Amino acid sequence: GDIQFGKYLRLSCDTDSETLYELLTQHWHLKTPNLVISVTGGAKNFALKPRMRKIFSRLIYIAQSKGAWILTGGTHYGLMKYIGEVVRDNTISENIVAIGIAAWGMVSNRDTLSAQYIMLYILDNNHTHLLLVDNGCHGHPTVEAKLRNQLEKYISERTSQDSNYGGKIPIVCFAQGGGRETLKAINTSVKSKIPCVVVEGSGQIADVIASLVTSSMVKEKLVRFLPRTVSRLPEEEIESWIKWLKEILESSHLLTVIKMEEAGDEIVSNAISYAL
Amino acid sequence: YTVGIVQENNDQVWKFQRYFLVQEYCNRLNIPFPFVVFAYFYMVVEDNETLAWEGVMKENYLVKINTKANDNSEEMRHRFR
Amino acid sequence: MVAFGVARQGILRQNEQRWRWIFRSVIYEPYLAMFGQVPSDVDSFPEWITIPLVCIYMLSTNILLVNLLVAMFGYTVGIVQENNDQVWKFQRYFLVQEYCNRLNIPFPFVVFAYFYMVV
Amino acid sequence: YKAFSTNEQDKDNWNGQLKLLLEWNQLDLASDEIFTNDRRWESADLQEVMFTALIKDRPKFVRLFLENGLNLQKFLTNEVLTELFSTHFSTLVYRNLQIAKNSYNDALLTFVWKLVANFRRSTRHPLQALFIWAILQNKKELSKVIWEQTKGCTLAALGASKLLKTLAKVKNDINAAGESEELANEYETRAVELFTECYSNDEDLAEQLLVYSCEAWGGSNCLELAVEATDQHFIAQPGVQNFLSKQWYGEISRDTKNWKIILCLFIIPLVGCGLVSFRKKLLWYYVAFFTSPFVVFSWNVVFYIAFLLLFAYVLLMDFHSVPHTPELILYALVFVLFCDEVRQWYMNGVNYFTDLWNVMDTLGLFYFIAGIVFRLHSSNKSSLYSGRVIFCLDYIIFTLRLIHIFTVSRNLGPKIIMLQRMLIDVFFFLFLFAVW
Amino acid sequence: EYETRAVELFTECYSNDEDLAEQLLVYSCEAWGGSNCLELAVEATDQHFIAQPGVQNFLSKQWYGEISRDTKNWKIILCLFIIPLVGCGLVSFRKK
Amino acid sequence: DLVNFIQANF
Ligand SMILES: CCCCCCCC(=O)OC[C@H](COP(=O)(O)O[C@@H]1[C@H](O)[C@H](O)[C@@H](OP(=O)(O)O)[C@H](OP(=O)(O)O)[C@H]1O)OC(=O)CCCCCCC
User: What start and end residues bound the annotated signal peptide (chain E)?
Assistant: First the structure.
């Protein structure tokens, strides 16, 4: 069904990325000079920090300039809603392309079809494109991460001659919020050789990685960054978090961290260019 | 006494009067007087996009006005500390 | 001034058929029916109500004239505010170029210069 | 705060900590401890704290609450707004507002007074109402915070500037008037800068915004409010002048030479002969050219000159007890003027009478009709002479109206503008000279 | 320097309060010099001190007396000739 | 077309 209040499509998890990319390229979207994915995290409330706003404004401006694809969760609650609102504002002012990928089961209201979705999770209507994964139907745990990672890896495998970047289209992961899902996404991106940029100074896991960029120090940083999260998390959760931290830090050159001191203009662009 | 009156620039006042005259002659039946007589007899018988653009330019203006504090050497002192 | 003179001539003389005479008089009377001269006063249908009319006409003309003069001088202070030194230097360049790229001979002796130049 | 938190008696409850920080105005601690990424927030949770911050004049806390997922539109309910206006509105400000309403009445001031009365006694633009409430009480920071959320930012700034100026014209309290005046100047500067920047970004969107009339913000647009406030600075900006010039020239290209247009005016066929390259078929060219306000103005001035010449000819050469054909033509032309005056009177009648030059023109028309009535009495030569006198008065006042037309040209417009003030001062000087 | 100090002090104080400032201005000390602030400023030709908004407001209030300072002058002039208009709603008095 | 393509894809 097409949400109107863009295009929302329900696709199974076991879907070949090649077919989706061919569909998008043939008649829906043009070749993408750049592609950036943002992992907001489990939290549905995004704190409008003094610095995060400018960072993401610069990110969206860069994406518009380069005609990039912005991938997010698409949830109307949290950072994704802010990104969608900023995309709509820029559109009101070359078209920006935003894809929100989520799980159909977690969606609160399901409308089948040109059915219109009008306001359990809620998705932002600002996003121009949306994808709903459905393998564990009516399943609380998130399952879109696998498809997102597979699609990102396939797009990395692609090759565009027009782009100045040699061969494959550039892809940059982004991490501003903390959470287990964010850490898993960072691990998958690192295993995929696609660089990720972590916003140091904001978020729990992001700041932990920034400080790391051993095991006891990692645990102490994780506890300090998210006291409530570490207190609620069990010992097995802490062990898994430390394992993922060690796995991601094994490849430091890929990950890039924005310095807390660095707060000038065009810092996001500089960091992304350095990572690429 | 007259030198003081002429000290004040009349350019702004003339521009104001120009606006008045332009409004008078624009919101008016654009016909010459010889042919305007029949005009009276004949007479007797988007926004959201503009406001959004205004808000965007407001965001840019607010950033520009708030950058003034950037020139202060406080940031360097904080980095040093 | 001419509008005032037209108003005065209309009120004083009626149906003046001499087109040359009326055309000259309309312009000529208001200026000389004022500080310049007083032919209208000699010419001066109730008189007891006529005298205030000429009095007010003269008062209005005088006040308008003084206002014009003072406004003109005030306007002039702005023109003189701008320095004329740069403009004079510009004109100096123009004159120097005119007199330099020219046969450096006085006018009494320059006549033969053109004949020599042609050949 | 440390005693309240470490005590553990109310550590679980966060609203108490937030209220405590708000009361003492500890912004940094509020941003650090109470507000954190882990904590979840809802607008209903903040409602009361936001209201208290508004009451206590805590602009920074208001901004912080707005940033952290607070919907100002939903919060500003009718009950909240009426309660705020009824109780937390200072009596001194209400007295000043009444004084302004009585002594210095204005189109916008009566509107805001009606809005205030409606909310005080018992929801089109709640944001505008809140901004007005902040402005009337000379709250600089809170007013700016609210303004950052309004949709009509430049329009709101102009309205605030005008309202603050008319409020500062009061004399009940000097300090409040000075604060209002400085705040008005600040908002005028903000509006000018915002419109400049925006006009630099884009031109057509800027002009659309300028001419746009809000959903009854005050019943007026940015330009009208600037004019009413005599904001010469805002209109003198390049963008507004360019807009006015485009309006004046219409479809005609603004860069085309004026002498070309003047020459082609007399000679019709040149209109579509390659001259006057129109900004946007020969018939289309002709209609566009003749619909131009500049061409209409030139035609009107030529017609007025011809009418004055005919009037002077009638008075000087052809005046008889019985009207002649030139006199009938003069009557027709003055009737055309009269019907044009009626048409213009239908609109802005209050402004029609208020204008000094407009009242002068109406008085001249009345004088002309009176002179016609006097001249109709051919039986008595005295009546005819009185009608002739009235006709002379009509001629002079018509010349005054003609003088008004010349103001358009830049060459001699400022000259007349200066002449008026010089005339006033010289009249006073001549009065003193007269006395001694 | 002392003139500047006095001007700033009186401005600041007149901004804080109005009635206390005026009482201070008209107050005569226990024979400091036999004169008040206003008289001393006048004798020194301190035009700067008197030109300040507070002093001008005080003088205007003294000039208009009980009549409200914000009322239109033409109303007062018109009512002067016509006595009955005095208590007919015009000239709203500041204070039967 | 678009509906048929979507059905073919899934
Ligand atoms: C005898 C009684 C009176 C006789 C008539 C006497 C009437 C009379 O005296 O007006 C003179 C007037 C002068 O025009 P004027 O020079 O002021 O026009 C402006 C001027 O050229 C400025 O310099 C321009 O700005 P800038 O240089 O770029 O900075 C501006 O362009 P823009 O910036 O706005 O785009 C121009 O608009 O010419 C007419 O067209 C009026 C039509 C009159 C028609 C006359 C029909 C006979």
Answer: none
Mutate to test the interface with C, among D304, D305, D330, D426 (most CBs of C within 10 A): D426
Q: Is there an atom of ligand 1 within 6 Å of D103 CB?
A: no
Three-state secondary structure readout of chain D: CHHHHHCCCCCCCCHHHHHHHHHHCCHHHHHHHHCCCCCCCCHHHHHHHHHHHHHHCCHHHHHHHHHCCCCHHHHCCHHHHHHHHHHCCCHHHHHHHHHHHHHCCCHHHHHHHHHHHHHHHCCCCHHHHHHHHHHHCCCHHHHHHHHCCCCCHHHHHHHHHHHHHHHHCCCCCHHHHHHHHHHHHHHHHHHHHHHHHHHHHCCHHHHHHHHCECCCCCCCEHHHHHHHCCCHHHHCCHHHHHHHHHHHHCCECCCCCHHHHHHHHHCHHHHHCCCCCECCCHHHHHHHHHCCHHHHHHHHHHHHHHHHHHHHHHHHHCCCCCCCHHHHHHHHHHHHHHHHHHHHHHCCHHHHHHCHHHHHHHHHHHHHHHHHHHHHCCCCHHHHHHHHHHHHHHHHHHHHHHHHHHHHCCCCHHHHHHHHHHHHHHHHHHHHHHHC
User: Burial of E58 by CB count in 10 Å (0-12 exposed, 13-18 middle, 19+ buried)?
Assistant: buried
Residue of C nearest to B4 (CA): C74
Cα–Cα distance for residue pair D215/D221, rounded to 1 Å? 10
Chain C within 8 Å of B48 (Cβ-Cβ)? Answer: no
**Residue B11 sits at the chain C interface (C-beta within 8 Å):** no
C-beta separation of A193 from A255 below 8 A? no
Residue type, D347: M
CA distance D120 to chain B (A): 30
Among D134, D176, D179, residue whose Cα is nearest residue D159: D134
Residue D83: half-sphere exposure toward Cβ, Cα within 13 Å: 9
Residues of B in contact with A261 (CB under 8 A): 79
Please indicate whether, in this complex, the C-beta atoms of B16 and D232 are within 8 angstroms of each other.
Answer: yes
- A chain contacts of residue F9, beta-carbon cutoff 8 Å: 11, 15, 19-20, 23
B26 in D contact zone (CB under 8 Å): yes
* Distance, CA of D192 to CA of D131 (rounded, Å): 19
Q: Do C6 and D415 touch (CB under 8 A)?
A: no
Closest Cα to residue C4, out of D326, D396, A198, A7? D396
Ligand 1 atom with minimal separation from the D411 CA: 17
Query: How far is Cα C16 from Cα A224, in angstroms, rounded to an integer?
Result: 109
The residue among D275, D273, D186, D188 whose CA lies nearest residue D228 is D188
Residue of D nearest to B40 (CA): D343
- The reply to whether residue B6 touches residue C74, judged by beta carbons under 8 angstroms, is yes
Q: Which residue from A54, A90, A92 is facing B49, i.e. has the nearest CB?
A: A92
Say how many Å lie between the CA of residue D246 and the centre of ligand 1. 15
Contacting residues of C for B8, CB less than 8 Å apart: none
In angstroms, what is the resolution?
A: 3.1
Q: Could you give the CA distance from residue E14 to residue E40 in angstroms, rounded to a whole number?
A: 18
Smallest CA separation from ligand 1 atom 42, residue? D298
Å from C15 to nearest chain D CA?
5
Dihedral angle computed from the Cα positions of residues D52, D56, D62 and D68, in that order, rounded to the nearest 10 degrees: -40
Q: What gap in Å lies between CA A195 and CA A173, rounded to an integer?
A: 6
Contact C74 D312 (CB under 8 A): no
Token reading at D12: 């679980």
- Residues ≥6 apart with Cβ < 8 Å to E43: E35
Tokens of residue D241, six digits? 């002048």
Name the region of A179 (left: φ>0; alpha: ψ -120 to 50; beta: rest). left
Tell me phi and psi for residue D250, to 5 degrees. Answer: 60, -135
